[PDB]
Amino acid sequence: PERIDVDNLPSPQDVADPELPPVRATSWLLDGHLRAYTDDLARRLRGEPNAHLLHFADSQVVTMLSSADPDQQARAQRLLAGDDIPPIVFLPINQPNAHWSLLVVDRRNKDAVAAYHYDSMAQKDPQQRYLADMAAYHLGLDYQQTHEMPIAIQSDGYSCGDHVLTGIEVLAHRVLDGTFDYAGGRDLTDIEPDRGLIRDRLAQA
Amino acid sequence: MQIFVKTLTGKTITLEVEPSDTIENVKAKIQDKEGIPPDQQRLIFAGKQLEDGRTLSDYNIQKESTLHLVLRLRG
């Protein structure tokens, strides 16, 4: 006996991590940090016009798209590419224990889907675009059509996560203003990430 | 007794553990088999995260149980 409660368990990626280390001035960002930031952002945009078009994807779900288990990758596609899923999706792309980069997919036009990849590294790694291609491939897109877009070049070896979070926040406010669609609307050449503001968001959330 | 550990990329890791084994000890076995340091491993069972200082028996984990291994991704 000694019955164990299994009534309505969360999926593994939604289980909390109470031992999640705090972020500092020079540490690399973790996936738990990225999600805490986007969970708070989605809350700050709630009720604003056009906020219903955005969806910030969990990085763990981005990796499940390439899972060898077919049930897992099907769950990821239901979470990222369904009829009730917002058409503008932000996918964090992780090179394990190395780098972070951003991939955006816009599905407003179902007969022509646009994809944008942002990589803040000075000399780009072919392996990073490869992982962005796998994500688009598993989302039913042609990876050859993904655009390699401009973003501010990191001047340290730890703020690639900051560039990802800042680009997500900056672009989201452009969807709210309607400037996302102007010429150069998806250009992030002039962003300036702020470690202190990011730490502030995580504290007061 | 043999337990199973499933990652989110579709890999199952099998282990030969004892009920008296600690959570930290199980993680070292996973390090031995896959090279992942224990500072990155998050073991999950019945939708709950396991504390390093408890035992497999404390969580009523029986033979052939399935655990989830979620990683702390960094960059």
Residue numbers in the entry:
A (entry chain A): 311 to 515
B (entry chain B): 1 to 75
According to the publication:
CE clan proteases, specific hydrolases for ubiquitin-like modifications (SUMO and NEDD8) in eukaryotes, reportedly serve as bacterial effector proteins with deSUMOylase, deubiquitinase, or, even, acetyltransferase activities. Here, we characterize bacterial CE protease activities, revealing K63-linkage-specific deubiquitinases in human pathogens, such as Salmonella, Escherichia, and Shigella, as well as ubiquitin/ubiquitin-like cross-reactive enzymes in Chlamydia, Rickettsia, and Xanthomonas. Five crystal structures, including ubiquitin/ubiquitin-like complexes, explain substrate specificities and redefine relationships across the CE clan. A comparison to the previously determined SENP2-SUMO2 and NEDP1∼NEDD8 complexes (Reverter and Lima, 2004, Reverter et al., 2005, Shen et al., 2005) revealed differences among bacterial CE DUBs in three variable regions (VRs) near the substrate binding (S1) site that were arranged around a structurally conserved helix (constant region, CR).
To understand what structural adaptations enable XopD cross-reactivity, we determined the crystal structures of covalent XopD∼Ub (2.9 Å) and XopD∼tSUMO (2.1 Å) complexes. To our surprise, the VR-1 responsible for much of the observed XopD protease activity was not a β-hairpin as had been observed in eukaryotic Ubl proteases, but, instead, was extended and devoid of secondary structure. In the Ub-bound structure, XopD VR-1 threads underneath the Ub Ile44 hydrophobic patch, with residues Pro322 and Val325 making contacts to Ub Ile44 and His68, and also coordinates Ub Arg72 with Asp327 (foreground). Additionally, Met374 of VR-2 contacts the Leu8 loop of Ub (background). When mapped to the XopD∼Ub crystal structure, the changes observed in the NMR titration experiment nicely agree with contacts made between XopD VR-1 and the Ub Ile44 patch. In contrast, mutations targeting the primary Ub interaction in VR-1 (P322D, V325D, and D327R) all showed decreased activity toward Ub substrates with little-to-no effect on tSUMO recognition. Arg72 of Ub is well-coordinated in the XopD∼Ub structure, as well as in other Ub-bound DUB structures (Ye et al., 2011).
